[PDB]
Symmetry: C2
Subunit: 247 residues, 2 copies
């Protein structure tokens, strides 16, 4: 990678990435755990880089009607980027189209709700009541995992829930009450740290990883993987999580 | 790309390491000698991907480490590098030394380093305390992952731990030494969880430390990595790996 230039797909997703929309130029508009990883990779491997956001602002899912991707996944497949540098969850749908780097973090699906003492014990119970609404964000990993689960009652949850635009919309809706938001543990841990009236619904389920996304046959995968493994082994990832997560 | 596994015959590196693999030494032939969590994964992969297979054990019965004097590997890693095997099918820990020489599949389990101790009286809170006392002896198994992680660690007191500890040949030798008392064995969480379940007089030394994964080992440029990775990810996503851990790992505790 010495001398090379990498186009990196990314979007804001706190605390992994923060994007300043004003008051900055170029790479300096970006900060966060993933940015710190990229900066260290660029120093050690000798590449320059820039970040490219998807125009549709989505992470990426496969639309089964059109058989087309959107989001950062689509930008990668379209060769607009060389790597996706974000908390990119591992799932089989994506794995059919792209590769993943060595992982940097473990993660699970977590469901949360406002108000102490919820009667809900498990998310499928939502289908048998009408006190609570619920939802997942469109074109993001949790939606895909639930839609591909062997138990099609999870597809019902997705199909019958509110389609949320983005993390801000989801958290707003959650804070509005009587609403179960289903998303990812680490993201919820950070972003709801001060919401003392928000509680888990059931236990976390599904085990997956956060990694970077790479095109199949990327000439850079070996080096990125080696360096990411070293980051984990040396404790750098843990140090960055402590730096960036609340708190 | 074009190459797939249909009709291929894979040679798989493995050794006994309960509950991942059990190897019967009599009364069986060939693949039928093997059982366990990893064997169940291999069987399912073979059916879905269309290969036949056999297991090949290293004569040295080592997992594999890099000798800094000779710059040569040993164990299953060496057999893979020497084309005796096509994949290492075991609880193979991810570390940077191995990553310099081989690739890994998609991971099937998370793991950490765990230290355990047998002994009455004063005890220990963290493994580096071992260096400033002589009540307890201690050890790691040679040419296995925990030894490599401790020798790699940027705090060279962990290299001291390895260099000044007792040499342990294999997991059976380590566990018998631990059971002998006044000993700290430093190894891996899942292995110790399963194998020490009924040792009510064995306790922890501090918290687990280091994060790594168990995966399968693949040679660089293997034409089979993409398929194995996809299928392993599907196993994880479908909950198959969790079901196999429940099936094979020890339950209850007399303790």
């Amino acid at each position: 990678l010495i001398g090379r230039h990498l186009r990196l797909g990314s979007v804001e997703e706190q605390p992994f990435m923060f994007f300043a929309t004003e008051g900055c130029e170029g790479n300096d508009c970006w900060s966060g755990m993933v940015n710190d990883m990229v900066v260290k990779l660029s120093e050690d491997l000798g590449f320059t880089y820039e970040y490219i956001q998807p125009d549709d602002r989505k992470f990426g899912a496969l639309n089964k009607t059109t058989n087309e991707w959107n989001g950062m996944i689509r930008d990668l497949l379209d060769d607009k980027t060389d790597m996706i540098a974000i908390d990119l969850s591992t799932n089989s749908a994506r794995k059919s189209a792209i590769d993943y780097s060595f992982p940097f973090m473990d993660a699970g699906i977590k469901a949360v709700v406002k108000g102490e003492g919820t009667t809900l014990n498990q998310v499928l119970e939502l289908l048998d009541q009408d006190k609570y609404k619920w939802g997942v964000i469109g074109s993001r990993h949790p939606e895909t995992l639930l839609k591909t689960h062997r138990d099609s009652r999870y597809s019902r949850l997705v199909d019958e829930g509110v389609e949320l635009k983005d993390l801000n919309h989801a958290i707003e809706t959650l804070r509005g009450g009587l609403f179960v938001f289903i998303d990812e543990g680490p993201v919820l841990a950070h972003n709801l740290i001060s919401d003392c009236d928000v509680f888990s619904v059931g236990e976390e389920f599904q085990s997956f990883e956060y990694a970077f996304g790479l095109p199949k046959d990327s000439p850079y995968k070996s080096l990125i993987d080696s360096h990411l493994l070293k980051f984990r082994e040396e404790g750098f990832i843990d140090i960055l999580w402590e730096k960036w997560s609340s708190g």
